[model samples]
Every structure is written in structure tokens, then in C-alpha cells.
Target chain A: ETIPVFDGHNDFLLRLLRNPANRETIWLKGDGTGHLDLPRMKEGGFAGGFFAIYVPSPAHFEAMMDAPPFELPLPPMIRAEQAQPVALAMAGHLLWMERAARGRFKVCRTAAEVRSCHADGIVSGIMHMEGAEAIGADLDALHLFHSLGLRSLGPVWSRPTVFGHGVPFRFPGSPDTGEGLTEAGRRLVAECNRLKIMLDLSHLNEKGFDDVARLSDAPLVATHSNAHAVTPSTRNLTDRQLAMIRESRGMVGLNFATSFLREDGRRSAEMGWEPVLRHLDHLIDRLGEDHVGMGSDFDGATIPQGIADVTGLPALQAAMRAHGYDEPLMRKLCHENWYGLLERSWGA
Target chain B: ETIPVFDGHNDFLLRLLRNPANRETIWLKGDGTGHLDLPRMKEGGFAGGFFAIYVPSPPFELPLPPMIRAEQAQPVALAMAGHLLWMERAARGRFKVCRTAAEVRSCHADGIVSGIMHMEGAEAIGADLDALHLFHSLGLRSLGPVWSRPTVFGHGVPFRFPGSPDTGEGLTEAGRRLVAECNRLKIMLDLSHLNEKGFDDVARLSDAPLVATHSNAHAVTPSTRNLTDRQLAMIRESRGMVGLNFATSFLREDGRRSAEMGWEPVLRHLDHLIDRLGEDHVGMGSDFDGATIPQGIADVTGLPALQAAMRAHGYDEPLMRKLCHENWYGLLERSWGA
Candidate 1:
């Protein structure tokens, strides 16, 4: 029997936003185009996840490669005023998904809601903002968004803002790209803590991670990042960062993004489930079993072709079972860990 | 005869900015505040220099100290910038804030002090960078991104004795933008106070010549502020220039901030700089009024005595000319694209 999965991160909102007019049909009815549709999720035992709301850059971010080593220049900051409409649009698309598929899906606001949705066989979409570009400096929009069910946010997304810097998408590099948080960023952390909003550390740089760890009272959680010990992409967390998360009694979700999974830091799905197991092993070893879960970057990254879409998730569980992961550990990895951590983080 | 020195860096504006009310009297008539004055300049054969307009953080910007948040740094930067403009106006044509290399040459010819307005840190320019244009209009030609503190732009080299230049990470996103903007505006991006990573980022980004207006060779004295041999080579590769800083701490083998050391270390640094950077890139960046100097050249007045020592040590007139002023002019022309 397959354990139901409650993922830490996904980008279904971005997928829906890409085809706004036909989003309902695409999300509800299986569309062959991308990962994660309603039928596929039900087949894969995917109960729910943190559906990411990310603002797209004007130019498709290209990692320049004419030189020996490639470095993706951080996309220039999108002003709050500019990014709000895009963020709101993505958030609205997510809400519309729940409205359209009322019995089929529920946008979970708390851990209890997530568990209840799981028991009722309904997919729970936990509202999450990948970057806080929509929130103004005064943070009036933060309160408004929280009221609208935004439970998680990462302050930067591989860019600069009035708050802080994000790591540039650099392969074969360290996460120490720039200085840490601005004063506004420090305040944002405090406000998030006060509001019982979970702070996501996925796209933030090493300095930013340190800054947030020092400031926020909540358990440090990284939704979609891998261990740098396995692959040294700037998007991946360092062993030091992992230790900090462990010390905070927090958790790190094993990212399914193959670029982060591969030891060579290549963005190819040809690399098999071996890299995924390697990252899971590393995350477990460094973070302990309770602190590890899956953060499948569905619809956002090039995942392993063997697990091409959401339906292939069972193959992953079967692989875990074959690899000697007991049913209890598998359940913890799939859903229990995410549920408990969110319970701690949200104080529910 | 002494070669009239067109220096790369100085902190006399900071001296004037310190005494806000009677800045005119202090700058023109001499207040005996610190290392520089009009009488001292005339005596020392000081033709002109990049007078630094630096904003000091509250509690007076002690080197290698705590971090200043970006927002806190921005307002303080603006206040210092306002003071620089005021100081320029009060000079009443005695000091010329030169925008172009041509203007610098004109000021040098007119026997007026050519003050090329230089911001030691980019804190005055907000993230929006509206103040950058405003300051450029107000006569800012040279800009260093950091000054012994963290700002919106990047990290500065702290005052850690026997430290490597690798202080922290490279340029922040804002720092990168500032570099691009400066290049577009033809403003010389000064690398003296920046960390090694930030230096590399600027070198990679800027179209202008990499100029460290006030720094020493780290191989000679390993201060966090000094450039390593690799950094010097990069500067050389970019056809850039390095001004030999007169701060005693930077010159001494032991990295002591005392003024008792003689001109021997200075000569050795000059020889090393000339050898590494080639004679075309070496010039003076006397950190007068900002740091402790060698006893041999205590203030601006000591320039002739130092020149005489250099002459005694087999420095010819032509080499002295390049070291004193010509090199600075050429580098500034290249950097300013004028």
C-alpha cells in the first residue's frame, strides 16, 4: 500500500498561470503537457503540497556558458509594485483551482486542515509565496496575504530586493554570493515570527540563511533545496546550513530538481533515482530522519524521467521500499514529517 | 625641484565636513585640525587630488567593526554628500570640483586645487539610485562601493591587522547594479576599500580601468585593506592603476599604526608597485587626515623632503613626474573616457 504524500513544495500555480484561460481543464483534467494534474495526483497518492507562487522575470533567465564555468546572473529585482499583480494572479489561480474542484481539493490553512483533507481523500494546497516580491516595504500586504491564507514565504528568489539578496543560479560555486539581510529584511523575519508564518529558506543565500536563523523564532524550514555536500550548486544548502537546521530542530525537504540532485550539477533527467537516493541519504544522515521529507519541485524543474510526472511517485516509493526504507520511515518521509513540522512551525 | 603631486586619494573634505559651521574658515585659512590645509598644500607641492567625501556611521566608523544595515547607511551617506557640495561652494573657486580629466588639467594649470569629488562608499545612493545621478551632477567622478562596513552595495575590507583581503562574499545585486550604472556614467569605480571578492566582481563587470585610489601591496604588509599580488595583476591586466597609500599601518612590515617608521618602507613599496604594475600605473594616494603617516612624510609639507630622498635613492626626474602626477592624469583620462 502506498503512503499518501504531503509535499513541502511544488510550482503548480506557475503551471496554471502559464495557460490562464484553460487552467481549470489543465489542472482538473490530465494535460499531457506538464507534471501534476488532479487525476495524476490521485493516482500517485499525492494528497497535497505547498503550491509556490513565483513571479517570472521579463527575460527568461539564461545561465551564460561561453566561458569554462557557467554563472547565471541573478535576475534583477522586481519592485513590489511591479511583482504584486503577477503574484496575486498566481495566488488567485490557486484559489480558483480549489473553487473549481471543491470536493476534489482543499487549500489547507493549518496542519489539522492538511491532515483532515488527507483523511477525506482530498488534495490540500497549502498557499505559499516563493518570494516576497508582492509584499511592500511597510509590509501591509504581508498581513493582507496572511489573511488570504499565505502560510509560507521565502524572502528572495535568486535576486535582489529592498529586503535582502538571493543567491545567483551559479553552478560550481558557493552560496556566499553577497551580504545578508537589509534592516527591512530583519523586520520581515520578526513579523513572520509574530504572525506564526513559516519562513522558507530555499532560494535565499548562505548569508541570508544565517540572518533568518538568527532573527526568526520559528523552526527553520527549506522547502525546495538539496544538500551541497552532494552537489555544490548555489541553490543547494551547505552541510553547515544543514547543521543549523538540525540545531533549530527544523527540517529540509529533499528537492527532486535533478540539477540539484546530480553530483556533477547537470540539469538532465537522464540521471536516475540514484542521485535522489543519495540526496535523501545525505539529508537523513545530516538532518536525522524526523527532519527529512520530499520537496518535489513539480512543474518547476526537470525531474528524473523515470518519475516524469506525478503518477510516477509510486515508483519512487517502491524504490525506497527496495532500498530498505521501512513502511513507517516511508510514511514519515512522504507526509508525517511535513505535517508535524508545520504543526510546530504554525503552533497549531 | 619637486614634481607637483596630483594625488589619487585624500580625506581633507572629511576634515572640513567635521566642522560644518565654519568649514570655509577651516578649509581656506587652515584650522590646524589634521594633516592637510592650503598653506600645507602650497608648501608640499600638492597640485590637486581626489578629495574623499565619506559618510561616517554613528560612533565614528571604527574599522573592522559591526555591520551597518543598508537603510541606516543610506541616510548617513546623503548627509555626507550634502556636506561635500557645501564644502565645494564655500571654497569660492580655490578648490575646483573637476568632472572631466580636461577640467582636472585646467584646474592644475590655473594653480587651483583640483578636487575630483570621490565618494568612499555608495551608501548615499539609495537602492533606487536616484541620488547617484544627483551626486554626479553635483560633481562625483570617483565612487568606492564600501568603506570598512557593510552597506547596500557590498562589504568593505575591515581594519584587521595581518588579515587577507578575502573579507566576505562578492558584490550584492545592488552592488552589481551600481557597477553597471557607474560604467554607463563613466564614473571611476574605486577598489581601495572593497573586499577581494567585491574587487573581482568590479573587475569582471566594469568597462573602466580598475583604480585602487588608496591601498598598499598586501605582499608587503598584509592588511585586509591591501591588495594581494593576484589583485595587483588583475589591475595591471585591466591597464588600471594603484596609488601607494601613505598610511603607516599599510607601509610597516609589522602592520603597526605608528608614524615613527622612515621612508625606506615607502621606497620599497614604490619599487614593488613599479615592478608589478609597471611605472605607468604607480602614483601617490596619501591618506592624509584619515590615517597615521610615516614620520619622514608627516603631512603634505613633507612631499619635498620625500622627493629629495627618492632623488637620493636614484629616482630620475621623468620617473618622478610619472609617479607624482602624469600616471594619475592618464589613468583618470582612461577611466573617465574623456
Candidate 2:
């Protein structure tokens, strides 16, 4: 009884490659504190994931590999290829997985590649970019990165950028503060859509989201979001937002992060499946079936109790079954929907 | 039977001269509101007094009369001569009386006149060197000019002059506070029960006794009053003097102005005071012919009653007699003590 999954996100590859000492091409594991490791992924019936290549900020330099919200002042302007080393490092991590676990990992650059990798018993890895600070206004490097197998990108990450505004870590206020979408940001989305790059709306603020919806030709896919109706956090997608994504025939990856799950919106690993079900229920009511999928936001922060490690992914399956979700809907959420969306997006 | 009375002070002629229309020589008639007049003075043993040519401030002009305290900030300075004019006009009411008294007598500088010429307060004095120098150089002598108040010179009427420093309004805290200015101005020291500070200042600054033209002995009746025993001794030593207040209130121990509630206040008054203050340093300063009286000393004819009453008190003819008139008339000529 193997459960297949194509996760929409993970920061593991970038974290693991930060140090020379940790740079090994093996499923090296011994309770190293993080959400996803190779052994844990295998045990969890792992299939594939969108592995992000992000730029590390200065304050992030002293932190543990999988740090959250590391503060760094944005440089005056951003450049593509600024995070090229991080991307390359992540690409290397994929390669290391492929060599060390031949039957387990495969870097999937296209929908066909992903399907083939899954059929050939390989864990399909989609390379994604989070924040286009590394990508300049013209997105010349977005072009270069597309050629180098990047399939998805979030235009901003919890701060302002040359592209657009992200959700900042503020409490008690709407995330709609601050200016949104510089001319370059509007251009970034248009260009990404033109190039068939899957625009990850997870970190975008309301204004930027509206800009992208009005400008981009791509579907309104929010790679990680919970139902805003269930928990009132800026990170959660509002029903109107979910409807927009549904109208575009895009997927809503249910983020398992508790901050998006609990009533208090606390970013703690101590949360239950009920809140997750509540979000899914709201999304299902708003978007029906094909629009839903799992975006674990793994190895970022917060791995809840029953699913503390990637190996425990089956607990979600058990919980979904108990919550009366049929197998076909569950299948679409687990892998098929993500595969279909990627195929439609990856242009291959 | 007749009492030879000499008054210490009155502002009638000054007020009348200030307003000829107010015509205060008819002052004693009580037809008007002033301190002295004919009918009232005669009834009250109307005698001539120091008719002060004191000044007030404002409603007047520059180049004030002499011996005024030169303080410009107050209207009391600029208006002196007008006040003097007012006093002059009032004095004219009995202009003929200064010659011989049948109705009203006036004190004037013309021919040892019946009433003495005096100034009450000195606010009209200006600080201009030329003005002060001219005033001092002038034969403008025998001035008090500062009433029951203060001026740049020193304290004046204490609210108790010549009394304790705390007795009433004393010299202001401004130490250059002086009577030296009065001395420099050649003004006589009419101590008139001045505020302690003014007395102290005049005594320290001038070559004269603390002569009060008219005042009661404080040893007789403690009040905003005259020289004490020590003060009397000091004056006598300096050949300075006092002209006793003939107003019964000035003499009586229970002499509080609205009249005493008891009897024998008049005889007891002479008994108590004549011995204490002695005769030479004392003399008559009848504040008569004015308002504000004690019961027994009601009017002029009442004096013989006081005189005869004194004789009955076992006063030897000379001592008892001196207490009546000669004491005051003689002292009035005694270098006219500062």
C-alpha cells in the first residue's frame, strides 16, 4: 500500500547544501532536526516535490539551516543569478539523491519527465524559485533559469522586492499594507506567464495578487495556502482568492503549517488535523475537487505531532479517510492534480 | 476758664485751596466733608494748626512743590502744587482770621501767624538733581510732606511713626531707604509719630530732635502713636520736643475714637500721663476744631472743664497750669525742634 505524493514545496535541498560538512550525496540521517530528509521521505511514500532555490540573507548566515523569517535588508535592487549558487546547490542535491538512491529520486523538469520518473519508480523533484530578487526587472535570468529546469516561482517572500510585496510578519493588521507590484513586478509576472512558469501566489499580498490576476495569462495557483475563512491569518487564502484560483482552473495546495491552521494562528508544530480538514472542507466547498492538493511547506518550519517527520505523511491519509474524503479526491490531492497542473504549466 | 489751644494738624486749607469751590474755611460748619472748618473748630476750641501744603499725585502737573517725595511712578508726585493751591484757596476763607480770631484762625507764615505752616507728605519731590538741588537751596524749610506712607526718602507715618519698627508700616525693605534726602533738602524733622524706620532714619541723618509738631504720648496711650519714654528722653536730650495731642482720645487710656464705655477717662488720663511724659518735652497739640472726638472733650468750651478738672486733681498751679497752655506755646518757639 504505497501512497504517492508530489509536494508543492520544501527548503531541504538549500539548507543541506549550506555547509561543506553537510554536503554529502547520501540519505544521511540520524534525527537531524528538520522536516524532510531522504530516509524519512522514502518511508513516507515520497514521490516528488517542488524544491525551492532561494537567496539567503545576512542574518540568515548565523542561523541553523532551516531558519524562519531571517531578517535582511533588501539590496537597492535585485538581480537574477544572485541566488544562482543556491539554485546550483539545490540542483546538486537533486543529483546527489538520484545517484545515491537510484530507485528513489529524479529531478523532473517537465510534466512528461515527472510522469516518467514516477512510472520508473523515481521521486520526481521540481525545481522552484522563491522570490525574484535574484531575477532582475527584465527577468533575463528567468529566461536562463527556465532553460536550466526551474518550473515554478514565488515573486516575493515575506518582504518587499523589486517584483512585488510579500506578506510581512505583522499581527492584527491586514497584509494589504505598503505599495504593491513595481512596474518590474508587473513585468515579472507577465514574463513568467509568457514563459509558462508556474506563478506561486503563496507569499504575494492582496494587491500584488490582484495585479498578477489582472496581468498574467497563467492560472491563479497559490502553492501554499489555507482557507482564510477557517483561520484569519494573512497567509491563508481568502474564499474570493480561492474562487479566482478555481476560475483559472488552478490548484490550492493545502499548507500543513499550523500558523495557517490554528485559530490563534500560532506558528507552532503542535497542531491537529481538524484545522487542516476545516480548511480543506472550505476549499472543497469553494473549488470542488481538482483544485485541491498538499503543499506541506516542509523543512521550512513547524512539523506537527502525528506528522513530525516526512515518514509520517500517511497520517494525513488516515486523517483524510476518517474525515470522509473519497479515494479519487484524495488521489487528485496527493499526486494527480499537481501532475496535471505542472503539465499545463511546465510547457513540456 | 478759657483754654489756650494750639492745633497739631488739619488738611482743610489744603483741601479748600485744592478746590476753591469746595470752600473748606467754612469747614467747621460741617456743611462740607473735610477735616477742619470754622464752626466745628470753634466748638472744638478751634485754634490755628500746621496747615500742611502737602501734595497728591495726578490731576496735576510737572515742577512739583518742594519737600515732596520724588516718586514719578505714582500720581502722588506730579500733583503737589495743585494740592498746595487747593490748601491755599481754603486758607483764604479765613484770610482775615489769621490776624485775629473771632470765628476761624489760620496758621500762615506771614507774621508768626496763628496757624503754623506745614506739609503733610512729600511725594511731589522729583529725583531730578536740579529740582532737588533747587528745593534744598530754597528757603523752603520745615517740611514733613510724607504723611502716613512712604517715599523714596524713608518711612513716614507708621501706620505708627516713632513707634516700634513692627508697629505699622515701616521703611520698605529697600535699604537706601532714607530721610537723608529730607536733611539734604533742608526739611525739618516733624517726627509726628512717624513710622519707626523714618524716625530712625531722620535721627541718624539730621541734626535735630525727633520733633513731632503734634502727637500724643505713646506712654499715655499705646497706638499707632507718639514717642515712648525712651523716645521722649532722646528728644529732650536733643532739645527736640513733642506738642501734646489735646484730643481727649490722645490723652485717655481708653481713648479709642468712637468714645469709651467708662467714666473718669479724662481725669485719669491727665493723672496717668502728665507725670510719665513730664512737661518740657510735652506741649499742647490740640487736634481740635476737627472731627473724630472722645466723649468729655466734646467742644472748645469743654477745655475749661478739662482745665478746672486738672486743678482739682491736686495739680499745683505751675504743673497743672503748664499742662494747659504755656508748655506748648513755649516749645513752639524752641528752635521749632526738627
Candidate 3:
């Protein structure tokens, strides 16, 4: 029923609560259309993951989420005043989950805490910001988020934030969208390094990625991304970028989103395990074994039918096992690498 | 305005501003509080120096200072600048914000300790340098573009141990603008907080002689805040000078923050700066009210002991005077054209 898979990213905190009727039940009892629930967490052996606090774009703007055509438009930019309140609500919901679950689930702050959670059969989560619009160009709010236990963040999502540019949803295209980190973006990188908060380059464009590599002292990490060589989505990491991550001794969590995994770069769930396994192989080949893991974009992107929900992770593990992944490599990909990356990036 | 020497740096304005409960009275009447005060200044033969206008990051244990918001930083810097002006107005005739070497000497002649308005970080000034103009009109003559936190101008050297100052990116376009503007205004740019890249940028772009108001010898102590031999040579070649930092950690070879050490480390740094920049370019940049200092030099009152240490170390009267205050005055005169 389970494989002890620790996910790299999830949008559960921002998702179900927005669908208010279920409230606490969606997370604990598994009623929402979302990909994860406590019931499936146990059935699929879902240990924990980076629970993302995200701000959906203003509904007026058209999104490129499911689309993978040329020049996919980014979501409209959000104001800090609006984003902060929404970001806080999502964070508060996460806290509510920890309280409602009692000892069964927890919001973890360190690698050691998550390790303990796994040992005790508790589902753990690390507060992560998938987008940093809530963090203003000035970045004073970054402190409050870090103090509130947000241990990881991306400076930009699929939007043109004041901090930096995020790649649009382009298929078979380059990540080099435009110019690099703004002055404010450079400040964001240094502050993250200072605070020991892991910076996610998952949604950042190529120039911003290079900027982070030059400025950041910590290990570079892409919490939810795939190999561009396998599937040339704008969201995927190119081989040159992968080699740079390897040079920094960093980590890359393979994205389970259908668009990122499939060669067609479409969000259809009808996909084989070949694309997924190929990404892992390419990631391991470029970034080494210690740097690969599963950053399933749960509740955030379209999932493949083979791994339909949290419960389907065990089936995915079976696929890996049948495809010649040894027990130790399975253990590393399932959860170990996340802990290693977190420990190095967070210094905890 | 007693002038055996004008210090290179101190943080009394920020210190007094933070002590709002006491406010003006604490500095007016020497409270046994922080480092510098009215009576303490007179007792220690404290000449006026570059009183730093700096904003501290909120409490954090990291080596790198947290980057603050420009909006949050601007007001505090203005308040610190206002504090310096208020001290001059309240001191009656004893304090004056000297705009030039001539004014400083005039203040010295009148026994008025000079307050050369200096901003340690340019966060108060916007990208257009509008506030920079206002501060200059108010007698500001010195500026440090960054202060261990990334600013619009450039990156700063993080307060790291046994580390090089080659930390990160150099001057931004805004930073180059600042250099050009400061040179136009004849304001002395303090290189104390700049990393190697910023330092190099300033060295290349600036017409003014390079002056690091408060920094130590990197070869001697290895603190990122200290200057490398190449940097010293740059200053020497430019006929610029350096002020010895009184921060214990910057002076100590072990880079520990404890104030238990004696004057030997202090003397060693002074000797090295003197050797690198020659005897005519060394001065003191005591970080009073800013960082821990040696117990031997426990406050403004302890400065006399520092002078005695110089004498005991075989520094003759002529060299001692230059080290104490003359070098600073010379640099200011050269840069400010007074």
C-alpha cells in the first residue's frame, strides 16, 4: 500500500482550503478532487513533502498551465498586499492540519525532525513557498515567513514578479526567456542564503538560475522539476543546467506532472512509465545518484493515471523495482535525497 | 572640538538614537551608558570623526546580515542623520558639523569637536541620489555605499571569519552613479564595508583618493572586514590612507569577538597599515558603541591608554600625531578640497 515516498512539492495547503465545503475533512478524510489526502497518504505510504504555500494568479488572466504551445503566457503579476493575506491563510491551514492530525501528522522544520517523523510513522511536511510574490521587492516579509517555518521558496513562479522572471509554459523551447535577476532579485538570493532557506529554481528562468548559481553559497536545488533532455518543457531543467547543479553538488527532484514527463509535453494522464524512468536515468547520469528524487507536483499539476493520486505512489515504486532499480537506489530516490538536500540547504 | 585627532568612525548617533528613553540627555550629560558622550569626549581628547549613520538588521545569528527593505531602511537613516544635526544644535558652541578641513581646524581652534556628517550605508538615499544631495547640503561629506547587506549601490562584505573580502558581485549601475555623484560633490567615499569587486569598482571609477574609514590588515587578522595587501598597495599608490578598526574581532588573529586581549594586536595592525601605506596614512577608526573593544580601551576614556600604547611601541611624537589625527585630516582636505 505504501513505499515511504517523500514528495518534493505539493499544493495541498493552497488547494482544498480554497474549496471550503470540506475544510479539514479534505486533508484528513480524502473527499476533494485534489491528489492527496491522509487516507491515501497511509495507503500509498506517502511520508511527507514540501507543502507549498502558493498564490493563484488573478482569475482574470488566462493561464498556460495545461497548455504547452509556443510562448505560453505567464500568470499576471500579484501585489504583495493581496498575496500576503492569501499566503498566510494557506500557511495557517497547514498549521490547522498539524493540530487536527494530533501526533499522526506534523510540520517539520529540520531534516532530523522529518527523519523522526518517518521513524514514528508520522506524515511530515516542510513549509515551502512555490512562488514569492507574497515576499515584496523589499523582502522584509521574508523574515516573517522564515520565522513562521517556511524553509524553502522560489523567487518567481510562472509570473513576471519584481524579483525575477519565471519561464512560461513552453514546450520544446528554451528556458532562456529573457534578462536575469533584477537588483531586488539579487538581494533575494543573498537573503535566502543568509536565512538558510533553500531557494527553489523550479520556476525561475535560465538567467535567474545562473544568477542564483553565481550568488548563492548553498547547494542549488530544484524542488519540483524534470529533465529537459527527456521532455523539453520550459519547466524542465536542461542538461547544461543539470551539470551545473552536479558541479554545485546539488539535488533535482523529478517532477511527476504529466506535461513534464511526457515527450509530447501535454498534460494527458495516459502516459507510460518510460518518460518518468528516462528522466530519472538522465538526472542520475548528469547530477549523480545522490542528487535525484521525486518532487511530485501533487495537487499542482496534472498527474499521470499510473500514479493517479497519493495512493498510486506505491504502484510507481513497483514500476521502478520492475525496471531494475535496486533497493538502495529506490530508498535514495524515494526519500533519502530530499533529507540530504534539506540538511545541506537549511544547515539544520 | 579638542583636536589631537579626529576618529575615522564611530556609531554614537545610532547609539543615542536607539536609547530613546534617555534621548539627548544621555549624550549631553555623559551617562555611564554606551561608548561616547560629551564629558567622555573631552576626557578622552576625542576629536570629532566620521559619526556613522547606519541601520542594523533585526536580530539574527547568521554571519551575513539580513537584507532590509529600502522603505524600512530610509526612515531610520533619516532619523540617525537628524540625530547628528540635533547634537550640533544642542551642544551650543561645543559641537559643529564641519564641512571642510578648514572648518574642522576652525572648530579645533575654538575647542569645538568636529562632527563630519558620514553615512555608513546609502540605504537612506534612493537610486536617483536625491537624498544624497540633501544630506550634502546639510554638511554630509562621507558615505559608505554598502554595510554588509546588499544595497542598491553594491554588495557588502559579510561579517565572515578568516574569509576574503571577495564575497560577491561588484557595483551595480546605481553604484557607479553614486561614485560619480560623490566625486562631483567632493565627498569622501568610505570603502570600509565594500567587498573586493566593489572596492575595485570604486578604485577604477573614482577620482578621489581611496579611503577606508575603518578597516584592518587582512594579512594580520584575516577578517573579511580587513584589507588585503593588494588593497593596501592600491591605497598607497593612490596616496590614500586607512584607519585602524577598533573592533576586537577584526584585530584578533583568532577572529574571536571577546574583548580580553591587550594592545599588542592593536599595535600590530597599526604597524602593518603604517608599513603598507607608510607612516603618513595611518589613523584610528574606533568602532565605539558599534562593536566590542579591548577591555584596556573600554570606552572613550580608554583612548588615552591607546595613545600610551603607541608611545610605548616606539612611535615618536611626529608619527603618533599623524596616526592619531593628521592622516585623517590630510585625506579629508585632499578629497574635500578645503
For lDDT, the strongest prediction is 3
Better-scoring candidate (lDDT), 2 or 3: 3
Give me the runs in candidate 2 sitting further than 4 Å from their true place: A25-31, A59-82, B1-338
lDDT of 3 at B207: 94
Ranking by TM-score: 3, 1, 2
Error of 3 at B58 (Å): 29
Pick out the ten consecutive residues of candidate 2 chain A with the lowest summed lDDT.
A61-70
lDDT per residue as tens, model 1, A143-193:
656756889999988889888989987788899999899999999999899
lDDT of 3 by residue, A1-348 (tens): 245989899888766547755667787787757788888888889999999988887421224545557456776889776676467557767776776788889998888999999899899999999889878675656765675678999998989888889998788788898778999999999989998899999999999999999999999999989988888888899999998899888999888888889888877888889988888888988898899999998888788899998888988999998889888889999999888888888766
Stretches of candidate 1 off by over 4 Å are A59-68, B1-338
Give the CAPRI rating of model 2. Answer: incorrect
List, for all models, the DockQ compared with the true complex: 0.01, 0.00, 0.01
TM-score of the first chain alone, every candidate: 0.97, 0.89, 0.96
* Candidate 1 chain A, poorest ten consecutive residues by summed lDDT: A59-68
Task: Tell me how far the alpha carbon of residue A208 in candidate 1 is from the true structure, in angstroms, after superposition.
Answer: 0.6
| Native-to-model Cα distance after best TM-score fit, residue A188 in candidate 3, in Å | 1.2
Looking at model 1, the pairs that clash are none
Better candidate number, 2 or 3, judged by TM-score: 3
- The estimated TM-scores of all candidates read 0.51, 0.47, 0.52
B250: Cα error in model 2, Å: 99
